[PDB]
Symmetry: C2
Subunit: 802 residues, 2 copies
């Protein structure tokens, strides 16, 4: 247990805590300005001149003094209440507030020994911010205390609420920009309070940083009436509190006392809610939220060159753009830095004075030190059930190609038992698709958690105020809740219809960026569990839907995060349920990855046994010798290769026909896509020798790919024999139609694959056969048109091994 | 002018209109069930049996009777008030309500002559829905009345509000699913009422289709208290009205009278607001919105197999999944279809009776016929200013490589004058980035439109309650408002920082899908203006930002919509401002496209004159002969090729050095990326002959690409000499750093490009030179580290022609 969770003080905040908060605010404003502006002379020692100012002034001031003020108060709260706390910096361009917080709390020097608590360390700290060879401008993963960089705005609330799930002792004050709140993902994130339980989860306090402006405009929420703003937050299930300061001549000490009193009222309300939830965990409370209204750039010069800067969008980026080049800007910068009276805040040796930090929390309660902000320190391996009990044994009993299994059902049973063995640290998220994607065996041991109204057992089923599945119709929610659940040390999986994965392409990009930086150069940030995403209801089988819903292209996006041997991104094609089991076990063991797991949920053949799946997954791509009819690679006339359940089924059927014609070939299945890249691009890929062994040195390769052919063409560009691959993929063709028609119109159907193999082998010799196969495709299409279902010869085919 | 906009009735709805609405509701419910279930015998003529039921039951019933009810009432309103109206079907899986609406209003038979108003046309209409060779399951672009297919939920409100901008006579009732409202994009779409003006724009009525459920769960908004739900809509600037029906034994005629009375109250309020706005167009009104609470699947069987179906998520998809296979399901289907009493709704010849449609609107007021729902019928070409006045003449006066122009400033001046010439039909959207991306010359002739609070001219600048620029910090808003502005026949452009384009990858995918279907097989849906997106503040120059903000990967996504010679997607690299002018003119003339226009906003050289830019754009890729030093392709030792402003600058500098060494080369710039694809993949690309002429038959090609090398490798896979291309692109390397460092770490800097050229030519001979160039790169990096700015020899280089 960290600290003493949810304790009230029952005494006023001390005057000494008020004095310390004002010193914190002054010193963190001072050092945030130092980071932006100063390449040397951090204490302004004689002579202090333009030569001390950076040549490239970069970073963001406007949000920063508001964050510094909130961080003083959150620090005071954590210390007084001993409260286990992670904050979220929504406006992550306020990085200098977050580096300052860590430098003050002592974690910065602990993690970065060269940046010492003295004049020399302070000079280094100022120069390195947003500087070549230095540190980022945003609240990046290399900053102690961050689980959210906040460069791409919108995810602050989903990360806050995912952090508190199954984390009943954790408090997350979530600082949200008022520009940020105009984003879609932020706007829906407020609604998460219907999906958490006040007894079994922790508590988020949203704090709207209502500073009136974004970069070049006021914000929507800052200019609507007070009555609408309060109605809005009350309508989303919060009790809104509002603080206003900095717009008149109120002295700063008065402001601190008034805020501390308010923040104690609010925290008391949170403690009452946590106490009450021990007895009534079914009534959803109105959680407090805070409207924090202060002038953007607070405490900077009110006017610069005749233009209003404090209290304006003009304070957003870097005021005094001429601070190095003109004596006029320089003198303004000088008076601004001096207004914080740094001579009272630092000792002559440049260390921050003891009376600046005596109010601060200590040890693992520090923001920079709490292990929830470095969740791989808390993470334990899952207790995984044995895989063999889930195996589809039909392949071993009856033959390759057996049965009509819906592949994700096996992963559902596996997930069910993972939750049973790990009952508060593995969650399933889904955008109203968990049952649709066949993972609902999990409901045998837990419920979908819903903390909103119930009506009747005639409609409410597998649903309770606490449980380990969470659904909301928002991919942004599911992805953000999961990412934070992982970043604070837990585990899970979510599922999505494949084309809708693209709604969160940019969140996958941010998490891939977080992982890249981390595996490269942040070794104190320990490994977290992987994002595991079941990508199902795919392009080939969108029975109730249609053309608009056919887009397997997240493959292509994930290919753009496969560099530098980071190994943070995997693309897997689950050929069948036994392969899906073997991929899932590997994903659930893995850390510091995004794993995209492609699987079909439609009834489909099972091709491999579980032992075969384990070996083939490790290699990445495998010959299926039992399906090849060639003696060796020299006797091969064509390599039949596929990735994805549906291209594999069609390729297999083509192989059966090609065999019956006397054509010699081998069959190769590809599961771990990026293992096709060359070793130069991927030091864990197939060597050239292993790749030639599979694909031959010089025979044609027909490659039936689940997604856009582009992906495979680009990946194998420097591979031996790549000129001989003919890659058939989805090509933006389809409608709402039968299964045969969907493959037919992308030349993916067995008949067209058989034809393409023949064309690659001898187009002249097989001209007539190719015509007949293309006419069979029309006849099968006409059959579907006339009769309402596909031709039996197509649907009823079973591989001859069965 | 269409109809008589914003007129009140001042009399009760007639009883005859009530009778007609109930008949409409009954006949559209009946035909929606016919579309889902019946392959023949649409009037249930003796014998009606299981053999008439479809073999594959696909589609969505739950939303549909609620849409059918609203469409009866919206139709009655349009007819009585003569009101110019487009609706949005948020729950676009309710396609059968939308096809039914068009069949009833007569547009369906007008657009599709084979689907006649009689028993034979009705049989065809039922069979074709979601059927091979037939029509989509959703409200697709092939349905008269659709501007929004609603398969990927979330964009209903942004499309509604973009439809009404500059459209003061248009009314848009926007039907929003209650599941849909849990999405991010929908949640922020409510806030659009702060960005429209009640005098110069039209009016959206949001109607929340609060049917209590999504696919397998209740919805958040349906289970919160009434008091929170109303506070929520009042807090977002609406006057909420609520209707509840279908949960008790109230007779349907009573329900229609009560709704018609309510909808007249609401429309009266909208007319009052429109009248008042003629005098006070500065006060933002509280626009009505409607909470419509009715049982999901309303009028279907209450229980099926002992399970509650009406009023449940169980009604979402297809009830009676056994209707063809069991007599038990069949008898339930039969009694359900009969409950609507089709014998009163159709004549013996199968035509819909006259008394079913006498209340309906006629002519261009019909939902299916209104030209706002087929905006290419209304669209006129822009009155474009002459391009030559914007030209950067420095190239002609002083030489190739001249000056320090910020390229988008020229497009800003061009846009300024387009707005001047087209003052109510060309809009600019931006996510708080219009000024940042340098398009703010537009503010010389218009303002950012903001219909929310003002404070002071010290902060409010270039901002008014009416204007042709709209900004909100949401890419989903900017993209959705623009798409609808185009779909209703107007024009525009938006700009985004490049990495944030990925927030709306999936909206680009939906609009590309809409365009693909349309150019292929919907010739009555006339061409609309293109989506034009200025992609700027790119990967190479993110001065205040950092690693997290470096992702030019929308290229790769757009490559997945380049099929079938649809020609709906363009990727352009603006080499400089004159090229940006020539690309922009082409984009602003073009129709039925998405145009991604890549340009740097940092000060940069200008390479080509405007005449050169016009020719080179047309070809797609061009030798720059004035920069090549080789006599002919046989004397070329390496082809220096680039796409993007920054790779071009670095390649050019490399060319200067290579020339000074005595190396023979040619320079080729690539603007229209997809013109690199082969003719087999793109019938408008360079022929093989033109491609070899540029890139040689067999010399090495060093290709410096703005984005991920993967894209170019895949595109040129079947091109002559492709094995000799070495593509250098962004490779996930960077930090917050100087301009030289960002190119350096992706091997994109001039020194590394010069080295790579030497390596391709003779790695042994040039081993030492390559070492020296790689050491210069370290020295330049160390200089940046020590000094705070890049080495003068890097920054001060100008191409020798200047
Ligand atoms: C407009 C924009 C920003 C303004 C945010 O203003 P605010 O939130 O009120 O913060 P503050 O405390 O400074 O006043 S930072 C941002 N990061 C972004 N993210 C996305 C998703 N799209 C665009 C940008 C561009 N950038
Ligand atoms: C859950 C989901 C749907 C339920 C929508 O329920 P509702 O809106 O209450 O409609 P109704 O009137 O039927 O009750 S349709 C949908 N389309 C989707 N779009 C996206 C962005 N992600 C997932 C899906 C999956 N699909
Ligand atoms: Mg702000
Ligand atoms: Mg619903
Ligand atoms: Na090749």
């Amino acid at each position: 247990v960290i600290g003493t969770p949810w304790q009230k003080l029952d005494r006023p905040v001390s005057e000494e805590a008020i004095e310390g908060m004002d010193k914190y605010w002054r010193v963190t404003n001072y050092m945030s300005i130092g980071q932006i502006y100063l390449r040397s002379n951090p204490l302004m020692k004689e002579p202090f001149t333009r030569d001390d100012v950076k040549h490239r002034l970069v970073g963001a001031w406007g949000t920063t003094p508001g964050l510094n003020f909130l961080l003083a108060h959150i620090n005071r709260l954590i210390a007084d209440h001993q409260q286990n706390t992670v904050f979220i910096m929504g406006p992550g361009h306020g990085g200098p507030a977050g580096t300052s917080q860590s430098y003050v709390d002592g974690t910065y020097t602990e993690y970065y020994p060269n940046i010492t608590k003295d004049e020399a360390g302070l000079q280094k700290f100022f120069r390195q911010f947003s500087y070549p060879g230095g540190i980022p401008s945003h609240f990046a993963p290399e900053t102690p205390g961050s689980i959210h960089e906040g460069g791409e705005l919108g995810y602050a609330l989903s990360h806050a609420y995912g952090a508190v799930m199954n984390n009943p002792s954790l408090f997350v004050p979530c600082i949200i920009g008022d520009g940020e709140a105009e984003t879609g993902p932020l706007a829906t994130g407020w609604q998460s309070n219907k999906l958490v339980n006040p007894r079994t989860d922790g508590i988020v306090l949203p704090i709207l940083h209502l500073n009136g402006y974004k970069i070049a405009n006021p914000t929507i929420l800052a200019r609507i009436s007070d009555e609408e703003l309060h109605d809005f937050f009350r309508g989303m299930g919060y009790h809104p509190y509002e603080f206003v300061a900095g717009f008149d001549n109120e002295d700063h000490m008065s402001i601190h006392r008034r805020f501390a009193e308010l923040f104690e009222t609010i925290f008391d309300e949170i403690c009452d809610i946590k106490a009450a939830a021990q007895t009534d965990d079914m009534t959803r409370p109105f959680y407090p939220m805070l409207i924090f209204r202060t002038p953007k750039g607070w405490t900077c010069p009110k006017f610069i060159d005749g233009k209003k800067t404090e209290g304006s969008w003009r304070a957003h980026q870097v005021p005094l753009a001429s601070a190095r080049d003109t004596e006029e800007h320089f003198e303004v910068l000088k008076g601004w830095m001096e207004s914080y009276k740094p001579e009272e805040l630092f000792n002559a040796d440049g260390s921050i004075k003891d009376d600046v930090t005596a109010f601060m929390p200590k040890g693992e309660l520090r923001i920079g030190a709490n292990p929830n902000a470095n969740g791989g320190v808390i993470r334990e391996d899952l207790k995984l059930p044995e895989l063999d009990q889930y195996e589809v044994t039909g392949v071993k009993e009856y033959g390759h190609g057996w049965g009509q299994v819906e592949a994700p059902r096996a992963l559902g049973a596996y997930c069910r038992d993972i939750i049973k063995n790990n009952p508060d640290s593995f969650r399933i998220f889904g955008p109203d698709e968990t049952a649709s994607n066949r993972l609902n065996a999990t409901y045998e041991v837990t419920d979908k958690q819903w903390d909103n109204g119930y009506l009747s057992g005639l409609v409410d089923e597998h649903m309770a105020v606490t449980g380990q599945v969470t659904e909301q119709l928002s991919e942004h929610q599911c992805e953000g809740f999961l990412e934070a659940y992982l970043l604070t040390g837990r585990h899970g999986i979510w599922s999505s219809y494949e084309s809708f994965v693209h709604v969160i392409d940019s969140m996958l990009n941010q998490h891939a960026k977080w992982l890249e930086a981390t595996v490269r150069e942040i070794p104190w940030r320990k490994p977290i569990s992987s994002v595991n995403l079941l990508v199902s209801s795919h392009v080939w089988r969108q029975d109730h839907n249609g053309f608009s819903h056919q887009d397997p292209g997240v493959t292509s996006l994930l290919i753009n995060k496969t560099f530098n041997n980071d190994h943070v991104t995997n693309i897997y094609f689950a050929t069948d349920a036994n392969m899906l089991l073997a991929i899932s076990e590997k994903c659930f063991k893995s850390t510091n990855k995004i794993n995209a797991i492609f699987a079909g949920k439609q009834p489909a053949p099972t091709w491999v046994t579980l032992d075969e799946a384990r070996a083939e997954l490790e290699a990445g791509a495998a010959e299926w010798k039992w399906a090849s009819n060639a003696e060796n690679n020299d006797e091969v006339q064509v390599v039949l290769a596929s990735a994805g359940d549906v291209p594999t089924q069609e390729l297999m059927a083509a192989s059966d026909a090609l065999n019956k014609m006397g054509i010699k070939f081998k069959v190769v299945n590809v599961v771990d896509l990026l293992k096709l890249q060359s070793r130069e691009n991927n030091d864990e890929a197939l060597t050239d020798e292993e790749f030639t062994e599979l694909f031959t040195a010089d025979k044609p390769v027909l490659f039936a790919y689940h997604s856009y052919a582009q992906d495979v063409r680009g990946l194998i560009y420097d591979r031996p024999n790549h000129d001989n691959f003919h890659v058939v993929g989805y090509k933006e063709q389809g409608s709402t139609t039968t299964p045969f028609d969907m493959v037919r119109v992308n030349d993916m159907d067995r008949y067209a694959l058989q034809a393409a193999a023949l064309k690659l082998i001898d187009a002249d010799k097989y001209a007539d056969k190719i015509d007949e196969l293309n006419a069979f495709r029309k006849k099968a299409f006409q059959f579907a048109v006339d009769n309402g279902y596909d031709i039996p010869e197509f649907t009823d085919w079973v591989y001859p091994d069965v």
